[PDB]
Structure 1
Amino acid sequence: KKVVDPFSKKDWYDVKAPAMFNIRNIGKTLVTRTQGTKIASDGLKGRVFEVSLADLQNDEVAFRKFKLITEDVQGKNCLTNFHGMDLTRDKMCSMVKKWQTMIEAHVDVKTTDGYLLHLFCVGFTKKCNNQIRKTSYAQHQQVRQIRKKMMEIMTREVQTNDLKEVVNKLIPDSIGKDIEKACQSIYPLHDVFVRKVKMLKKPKFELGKLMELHG
């Protein structure tokens, strides 16, 4: 029986990104008018938006995505925090080519602020120009030592430094380059990225750091 079309009731908030990113005004989102029987901030607070790092930086960051999760609300403002980085589908699919070895290593590590992260890396062998084998695999010995190197760096590079510096780090892709330096002594490699980061455990609350990062 005709009733309550719902937008004509809904309220708007402006999604705000952390400081390390560049521009910070992500877009807008709608919730229901708060009623005592309700907390529009409730239906608002653990929401996560996934935005492209390119929109976030402005660029070459076509591939790469960041998951931004709403951590608190202040009048039409909602302050989000790093929740993850993935790659998309197209980019990842495009690296994976036959005749080359695909190498993956991932490590789970606690940051300086508590956060627990599982953080993945990836690489592919490279034929080097005057090669004339068509393929370019690596040996099992190689990959085992390469993986150890990737893993050592990723734990080394996340142990020291908080969620923010990992972020500050993943933007100019300094890990990538570091891997490249530690591995060329062992075997070629084309591509190379920390390709995903997964938030496993969150520390408790603290608006302090959140604001430090926003505001």
Structure 2
Amino acid sequence: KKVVDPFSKKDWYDVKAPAMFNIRNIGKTLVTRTQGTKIASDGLKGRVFEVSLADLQNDEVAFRKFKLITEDVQGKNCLTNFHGMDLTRDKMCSMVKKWQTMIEAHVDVKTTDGYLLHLFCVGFTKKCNNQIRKTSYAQHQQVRQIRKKMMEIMTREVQTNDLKEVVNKLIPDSIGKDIEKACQSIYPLHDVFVRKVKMLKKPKFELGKLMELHG
């Protein structure tokens, strides 16, 4: 392409979030307006947006990022749905430090809806307030007992819920707080998070369920 001012041929569209988030407008995006065998909506669909939770929800922390996908276009609006979540680079780099044990786990699970998800969890040992020793290491069997409890709690919450109730748990991250309560009888833990979620497979398109998440 060597077009004279191709920005003369572009239409701006709006981008709209799912109805859970307290702030529902994402921003604006470009596409080339329709021509023979190349429609505008086919260029707008399947695009990914990555947004800080503090721009979706009013009172929240900035260090969780959510991924959203476009599914259909209505008038000048692009309508979006959930695709995953992650932690910012500078958060994870600040937690990993010397003289501690780091514990990690992962699971594959389905909702009551047809979605197949994969989840990752992390936790770190706690220095006790009287401790005069320099290091806070767990023994190998204590680490194995904690990892089974991470997987046990993390599978329980997804199997009996839909994607609506799953995202409502991830916004405050009640999953990581329940693991942090349960493990204190084995070894005290000080940072605990569901640090990443990936989607592996999903059901048919279902316009009625899409609009139930938007009305």
TM-score for both structures, normalised by structure 1 = 0.96
Separation of aligned partners in 1, 2:2 and 2:31: 22
Counterpart position of 2:63: 63
Compute the displacement of 1:60 (Å): 3.9
Counterpart position of 1:166: 166
- SS of 1:8's partner is helix
Counterpart position of 1:11: 11
Aligned residues: 215
Compute the displacement of 1:77 (Å): 0.7
- SS of 1:92's partner is helix
Q: Is the 8 A contact 1:53 1:59 kept in 2?
A: no
- SS of 2:107's partner is strand
Q: For structure 2, which runs of at least 5 residues remain unmatched after alignment? A: none
Q: For structure 1, which runs of at least 5 residues remain unmatched after alignment? A: none
Compute the displacement of 1:3 (Å): 2.9
Compute the displacement of 1:119 (Å): 0.6
Deviations 1:144-182 (A, max 9, x none): 111100101111111111111111011121111111121
Compute the displacement of 1:2 (Å): 6.3
Separation of aligned partners in 1, 2:36 and 2:212: 31
Runs of 4+ deviating beyond 6 Å: none
Separation of aligned partners in 2, 1:94 and 1:104: 16
In the superposition, relative to structure 1, how do residues 15 and 4 fare at CA in structure 2: closer, same or farther (>3 Å)?
A: same
In the superposition, relative to structure 1, how do residues 171 and 22 fare at CA in structure 2: closer, same or farther (>3 Å)?
A: same
Q: Given the alignment of the two structures, is residue 87 of structure 1 paired with residue 99 of structure 2, yes or no?
A: no
Q: Given the alignment of the two structures, is residue 148 of structure 1 paired with residue 159 of structure 2, yes or no?
A: no
Query: Identical aligned pairs, as a percentage?
Result: 100
Deviations 1:8-67 (A, max 9, x none): 111111111111111110111111102232121101110011111111113442111000
In the superposition, relative to structure 1, how do residues 10 and 102 fare at CA in structure 2: closer, same or farther (>3 Å)?
A: same
Listed as ranges, the matches of 1:1-215 within 5 Å are 3-215=3-215
- SS of 1:7's partner is helix
Separation of aligned partners in 2, 1:113 and 1:142: 35
Deviations 1:49-108 (A, max 9, x none): 111111111344211100000011101111111100000200011111111111110111
Compute the displacement of 1:4 (Å): 3.5
- SS of 2:6's partner is coil
Cα RMSD, aligned residues only: 1.3
In the superposition, relative to structure 1, how do residues 2 and 130 fare at CA in structure 2: closer, same or farther (>3 Å)?
A: closer
Compute the displacement of 1:5 (Å): 2.1
